[PDB]
Amino acid sequence: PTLEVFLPAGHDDARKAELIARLTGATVDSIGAPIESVRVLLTELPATHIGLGGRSAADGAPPSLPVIVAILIAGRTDEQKRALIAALSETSASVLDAPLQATRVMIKDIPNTDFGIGGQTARALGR
Amino acid sequence: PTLEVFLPAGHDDARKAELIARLTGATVDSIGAPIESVRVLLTELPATHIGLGGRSAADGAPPSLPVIVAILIAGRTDEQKRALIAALSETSASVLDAPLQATRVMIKDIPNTDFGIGGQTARALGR
Amino acid sequence: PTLEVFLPAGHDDARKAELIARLTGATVDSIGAPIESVRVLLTELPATHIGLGGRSAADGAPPSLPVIVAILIAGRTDEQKRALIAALSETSASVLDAPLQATRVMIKDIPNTDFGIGGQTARALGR
């Protein structure tokens, strides 16, 4: 699985490492992915680059991050996704001290014909 | 809705804020999302990170219009999507003094099982 | 590296597998990433979702795909990035039978503090 996490700029290395550790744990627990297959990509945004309701965070918008994109090989059930969504949301909210209501998760379900690892498709690899 | 706007570096904070405000308004008009639900994420990239036709601006490609990825919960109609592409594109061209002809919008539908709002799935809510 | 390729829906599995293999080789050649580290996700788009000039592909827009978002651990040189943009663009255009001028590449650099592999940061792992 590959997570892209949009978060406010400013957090220190220890907090970011903790975010990575905890979101990875949340993923492993939720959808049973091998821990070494979980990739986390943190994308920091300045307040001037974050908008909610047409207002920038620099101009006082309420919190709107983290937004997490979770890229998964197709196959997880609806209720497994529901569990993933709950776990990533509560974990990222806790670590970053963000309101849970502000979190958003978007799963991108990728057909096994449409996903490549090492140049080989997930379908080729039996996934 | 969440818009990720891939933006070449160089615009000042006022133009970024104007873009956030006007893209948000275009989204509200075209697909009728509650304004408070519209998120804009500006992904500002150096010219060396942006390829057009196989080259960066630094290697001779013409300047880049924004590329907007519009992430929607599944369920918007074809007419709404048509209106969204037009509105976001006209707004981009107007705000950035740029050719309408080169504006880009890519819509990604997320199934309601795959979308998370405050830790709950869209489907589990009324969506 | 993590590549997301926006492409028209409807390509057959053989062509998608070829695209994944060839984009992977292009990435290894260009920036020297270990082949097993290269992940590719294809994001298929309906023609009504693909906007250029404020009109969708289904509504008569000129070719505008493939668009590739390449997320890299930071540290690649401008020359490496130039090579990557060229190779990804030429390869994806060739495989998908698309015009080179339609292609776009967007590179996101992730600091090694912001990149996770198996719950550990790239910096932790000596990357």
Numbering used by the authors:
A (entry chain B), B (entry chain C), C (entry chain A): 2 to 128
Provide excerpts from the study.
Here, we have described a global mapping of structure–function relationships among the members of the tautomerase superfamily (TSF)4 (3, 4).
Starting from the short 4-OT, the transition to the Fused 4-OT reflects the fusion of the single β-α-β unit represented by the short 4-OTs to form proteins with two β-α-β subdomains that are roughly twice as long as the short 4-OTs. The percent identity for each pair of sequences along the similarity path is 42% between 4-OT and the Fused 4-OT, 41% between Fused 4-OT and Linker 2, 26% between Linker 2 and Linker 1, 31% between Linker 1 and CgX, and 33% between CgX and cis-CaaD. Among the characterized fusion proteins of the TSF, only two enzymes showed substantial 4-OT activity, Fused 4-OT and Linker 2. Fig. S6 indicates that the characterized Fused 4-OT protein matches best with 4-OT Level 2 subgroup 1. Indeed, both Fused 4-OT and Linker 2 were shown to be proficient tautomerases with 2-HM, whereas Linker 1, cis-CaaD, and CgX showed no activity.
